[PDB]
Amino acid sequence: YCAAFKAYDFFDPYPAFAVDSNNSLVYSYTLNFNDIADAVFENFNSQGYGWGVVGGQRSTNITYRDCNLNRVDMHNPYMGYLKVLDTRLGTWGINASGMGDMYLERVTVDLDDSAHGGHREHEGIINARGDFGGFHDGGLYIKDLTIVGEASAFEATSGHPVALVSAYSFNASLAYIPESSPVTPWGFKEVIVEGLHCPFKRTGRRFNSIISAPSIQFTVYHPMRVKLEDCNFNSTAFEKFDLRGWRVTPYNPSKVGIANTLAFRPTNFVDVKDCSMVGLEFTRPTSAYDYSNFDVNLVNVKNVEEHSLSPFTLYTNQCGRYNLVGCGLQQIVDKSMTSGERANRRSTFSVTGGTWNSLSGNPTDITYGNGYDIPVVATGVMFVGPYSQTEVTGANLNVAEFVQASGCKFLSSGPTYIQPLLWSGAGGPTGASANFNVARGNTLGLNISAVNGETSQVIAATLVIPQGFSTGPAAGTTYGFAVEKNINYQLGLNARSLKANVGLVRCSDTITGVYLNA
């Protein structure tokens, strides 16, 4: 019951290490407060092994400045604001349920936890309270967060590293939010991270998940908006967004099943800008909880560290709309590596600018519904990979089928640029057999060797695949001087929804090759 005060340089050489009869850690505090308002703590010192040194309850407008503590905690929720400025933290991090906003600025976290066996109450660095339901009805705003240490003792017991943000409940029948309550059970309402620095390299992934809920109680919602900027993870494996333990979103209360991502409103929003990671993965929830619809926006994303390759791959399992602007893309895979499930809904992909370097493989790996009804659209992109102008390679067919391109270039190895070859043979007046799929809207080039009675001429024809308003084939006509005749050609088409299957090549003269005229 205190208000309008300030505390100062209390020095504790190391915190208390208290155990029970079974040699298991129990609670102990250096500072413990109830029912305070408008408080400032400055230059507190209690750092090391042991239980968290701070325990607070039911407070308002708390500020920590220039402190050195192994934990900052609030058991009962706070309200107003909670500010942590220029502070060094220990392995516990922050554990606070609240009805306000949390501010973090220039905070260092050290994760070493060897003296504790594998004991860890909450699986993340910034947490809500697991014995209060895991709710935080407010935003979280972070500037210039630094991570050191590894927390290897916890990993040996559990098998994975710690998460960044966690919000879940230990037992839904003991800690939850009742229906009549006026509290909205957001995990966190908003998460804004602006600048994450990891000075030391990590073999594996930096975090188990960006936002985590590793229980099966389903008490709180996934955050409505997540934004990451200038985050350098400095790791050798992809980071992931795990959405497998969250309550059904309040944007879809009637639980309407979604068939196409554009036929329903977006429920969650994610923005990643100028971040450095090897890859990103989205894993959908299990059935009876899979009712979300994401809206993902990626801008200038690649890997900048020299210990790995530059292009990044995007794994996705969840229905949503994906937009990429100026990224160093490698591959788009419509499955989750963690679980293995392919996909069950139609999504949308749009790529603008940048480089698409697939290294040694195909640009895409999409199999849901054989890939029909999945619109991958690219504009002004430079494609690098195993393409060829003289042989029909796997990457040639993959890009012409799954990607609709306009104003794009292709380069395998050499100093110059090439046109991928899709078919080779002799398409005479009777027709030659063919079997390859091409996305509608792409432009194909035909190399034709026309001959009159005595003279001959090489013809370069250009053909556009119709969009699917008709069941007719793709045909055209052109003229050639020095032969004094018209050249007529036609490709037979079979309907494949968004794509078309070419089954017969026919021309009045001989067609020798079909190319992707990007």
Near a copy of itself in 216-275, by CB under 8 A: 224-225, 227, 230, 232, 250-251, 259-260, 262-263, 265-266, 269, 271, 274
Task: Give the one residue of 10, 17, 48, 106 binding a copy of itself; rule: CB under 8 A.
Answer: 106
Nearer to a copy of itself, 146 or 437 (CB): 146
What track of x and - describes contact with a copy of itself for positions 425 through 464 (by CB under 8 A)? Answer: ----------------x-x-x-xx--------xxxxxx-x
DSSP string, 29-89: -SEEEESEEEEEEES-EE-SSSS-SEEEES-EEEEEES-EESEEEEEEEEEEEEEEES-EE
| Residue 179 interacts with a copy of itself (CB under 8 A): yes or no | no
Nearer to a copy of itself, 153 or 459 (CB): 459
| Residue 182 interacts with a copy of itself (CB under 8 A): yes or no | no
What track of x and - describes contact with a copy of itself for positions 6 through 35 (by CB under 8 A)? Answer: x----x------------------------
Backbone angles phi, psi at 401, to 5 degrees: -95, -45
Instruction: Report the distance separating Cα 440 and Cα 438, nearest Å.
Output: 6
Which element (helix H / strand E) includes 383?
strand 382-384
| Residue 359 interacts with a copy of itself (CB under 8 A): yes or no | no
Task: Give the one residue of 29, 49, 103, 289 binding a copy of itself; rule: CB under 8 A.
Answer: 103
What track of x and - describes contact with a copy of itself for positions 365 through 384 (by CB under 8 A)? Answer: --------x-x-x-xx-x-x
Residues in 383-402 at the binding interface with a copy of itself, rule: CB under 8 A: 384, 389
| Residue 300 interacts with a copy of itself (CB under 8 A): yes or no | yes
DSSP string, 429-455: TT-EEEEEEEETT-EEEEEEEEE-SS-
| E strand intervals along 217-293 | 225-231, 239-242, 268-273, 279-283
Collect all residues with Cβ–Cβ distance below 8 Å to 350 and sequence separation of at least 6. Answer: 321, 322, 323, 324, 377
What is the 3-state secondary structure of 178-224?
CCCCCCCCECCCEEEEEEEECCCCECCCCCCCCEECCCCCCCCECCC
Nearer to a copy of itself, 61 or 215 (CB): 61
Nearer to a copy of itself, 32 or 456 (CB): 456
* Residue 230 contacts residue 299 (beta carbons within 8 Å): no
Instruction: Report the distance separating Cα 7 and Cα 510, nearest Å.
Output: 90
Nearer to a copy of itself, 154 or 410 (CB): 410
How near is the Cβ of 515 to a copy of itself at its closest, in Å? Answer: 4
Task: Give the one residue of 57, 63, 338, 501 binding a copy of itself; rule: CB under 8 A.
Answer: 63
| Residue 518 interacts with a copy of itself (CB under 8 A): yes or no | yes
| Total of residues contacting a copy of itself (CB under 8 A) | 123
How near is the Cβ of 434 to a copy of itself at its closest, in Å? Answer: 15
23, burial (CB in 10 Å: exposed 0-12, middle 13-18, buried 19+): exposed
What track of x and - describes contact with a copy of itself for positions 109 through 148 (by CB under 8 A)? Answer: -----------------------------xx-x--x-x--
DSSP state letter for 339: T
Indicate the SS3 state at residue 263: helix
Task: Give the one residue of 199, 200, 340, 360 binding a copy of itself; rule: CB under 8 A.
Answer: 199
